[PDB]
Design a protein around this ligand. Structure first.
Ligand SMILES: *[C@](O)(C(=O)NC)[C@H](C[C@@H]1CCNC1=O)NC(=O)[C@H](CC1CC1)n1cc(F)cc(NC(=O)OC(C)(C)C)c1=O
Ligand SMILES: *[C@](O)(C(=O)NC)[C@H](C[C@@H]1CCNC1=O)NC(=O)[C@H](CC1CC1)n1cc(F)cc(NC(=O)OC(C)(C)C)c1=O
Lengths: 305, 302
């Protein structure tokens, strides 16, 4: 028992992390087979950052202007290319630690593990959700860009995130590995509005189910609710509307614990209205929204890879 | 910026995780050089758990009763030994993924990452803390025993924890890698309760400094207090007493923020007395106590 914020094992990803330096800027890159993927803003100066034409800047760079280090070994850049907001540096050696992988674009609501790295050296691993406003609430200093987020699903590392920028509030924006940003964001040093965040209801419910699984059940009540009744209450706390799709997704967890979704919804309704009255759920005084129903089932059933 | 509960990269440890089977019980072993470390109750069934005689159970075992499995490779056991509550199986191969490592006994208040494992296979990593009552709030299912807690410093993995058991309330007890339990617990199904926990004051202070570095300062007040005076309050709300040691160790954070520990203590005194009063700190409605000063410095420097 017990329930933690739990990242995926990071080893498969650590072995892919390299340092990419261009002029003054050193950040992180992702070395898969004979390609190093990194944020294209590696090529910018201070000036260029305010308003980069990446085309001009790229044409003015040589293979020689990229310094790539995998630990204590310097790689050779034999080619370079830009796909949206990512730079692909072709090198003359394959990453011998390259895991089976895919590139996926994830949806808001979905979670993933971030491997924070500095100088191509992994420093930490933690779990984030893609917020409804396409940001993540991460932990990212100068030097972190190129840090990736991933999931492991069976025989496969699924890279979904590459870190680019910080936004107001100290939330973060990045791209998929095809170099398309999540959300309306653009890789330049401009004033840029996050857009309004909301609580991921489905995830809150999942977390409640995790609460029950792990013996923490004081918030359970004998009431139930209609989906509309529940959603009426939800809007007023800036919760995502719960949809039948969401109801259905909590299927397994509902069956697992014997508690209909709309029975849990009625618990959630009481929590929103009366609050917690001094109490905790799973060691937390607010309602947690960064566990997917999948995440709960994975942790509570010990699914490994 | 931003601040997140964060574990060490887990890969250095993932290369050491193996599966160990003795009859019916499977759990996790730690493969370092030519030795596999695992909890000694691997040699138990359930009709032993109530009062096991470990020396006898072990004497009736031989090298070949231990099946050790590194993914696909069965590793042959050529030697077995018992050190307190851990088993040391010598095997014919040295682990080529063995990192630089130490074995250390941590103190309550110190944090570490757990790599939860089942069937010799990493499942997940998370950060916890040795509580003052000598438990940790982990996430362990049946199969998780042998999972280890560690800290990484440079290239060197300091192994501090091995998982043995769940106590009621759903907190966990284990050993150091020399097989000694943290706290008064024993590897025997029996009359064992954690005992009430305290909040790690030094770590709460560390975390409030984190909130300041991240531009969250609503809770700062103009006042500073004394040690004695803070502690009288601490006792009342079940916080570890704060020592000059703790004051010293908060030194780098106090310097970096310009806020003196005892100034910060006054803010904490105010939070303890008044509550957080509808507001949050680093996205939390309660005072977080599982970040050490080192953790904060680490995460807020590089
Ligand atoms: C990244 O390029 C890096 O680590 N490079 C060495 C860098 C990481 C940032 C810095 C602090 N936290 C992070 O996540 N990314 C940037 O610095 C980006 C680059 C832009 C093309 C996308 N970036 C550059 C800036 F000049 C400013 C900002 N953000 C910023 O000023 O934040 C406000 C104050 C909220 C606007 C930024 O993200
Ligand atoms: C571990 O042996 C394992 O994973 N084996 C395959 C096991 C880990 C447990 C199982 C659920 N979550 C965990 O943390 N540990 C045990 O089962 C231990 C055995 C060690 C003392 C030798 N253990 C044995 C018991 F008989 C009972 C208990 N705990 C227990 O029943 O939990 C209470 C009721 C909350 C105290 C126990 O942990």
């Amino acid at each position: 028992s017990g329930f933690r914020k739990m990242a995926f094992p990071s080893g498969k990803v650590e072995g892919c992390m390299v340092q990419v330096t261009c002029g003054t800027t050193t950040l992180n890159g992702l070395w898969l087979d004979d390609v190093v993927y990194c944020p294209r803003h590696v090529i910018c100066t201070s000036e260029d950052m305010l308003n980069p034409n990446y085309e001009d800047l790229l044409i003015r760079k040589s293979n020689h202007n990229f310094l790539v280090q995998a630990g204590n070994v310097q790689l050779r850049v034999i080619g370079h290319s830009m796909q949206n907001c990512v730079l692909k540096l072709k090198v003359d050696t394959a990453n011998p630690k390259t895991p089976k992988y895919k590139f996926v674009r994830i949806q808001p609501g979905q979670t993933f593990s971030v491997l924070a790295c500095y100088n191509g050296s992994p420093s930490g691993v933690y779990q984030c959700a893609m917020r409804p406003n396409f940001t993540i609430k991460g932990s990212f200093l100068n030097g972190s860009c190129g840090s990736v987020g991933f999931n492991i699903d069976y025989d496969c590392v699924s890279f979904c995130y590459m870190h680019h920028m910080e936004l107001p509030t100290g939330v973060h924006a990045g791209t998929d590995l095809e170099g398309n940003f999540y959300g309306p964001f653009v890789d330049r040093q401009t004033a840029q509005a996050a857009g309004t965040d909301t609580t991921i209801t489905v995830n809150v419910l999942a977390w409640l189910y995790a609460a029950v699984i792990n013996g923490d059940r004081w918030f359970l009540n004998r009431f139930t609710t209609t989906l509309n009744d529940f959603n009426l209450v939800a809007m007023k706390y800036n919760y995502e509307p719960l949809t039948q799709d969401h109801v259905d997704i909590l299927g397994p967890l509902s069956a697992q614990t014997g508690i209909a979704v709309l029975d849990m919804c009625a618990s959630l309704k009481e929590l929103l209205q009366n609050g917690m009255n001094g109490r905790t759920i799973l060691g937390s005084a607010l309602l947690e929204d960064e566990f997917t129903p999948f995440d709960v089932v994975r942790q509570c059933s010990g699914v490994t890879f």
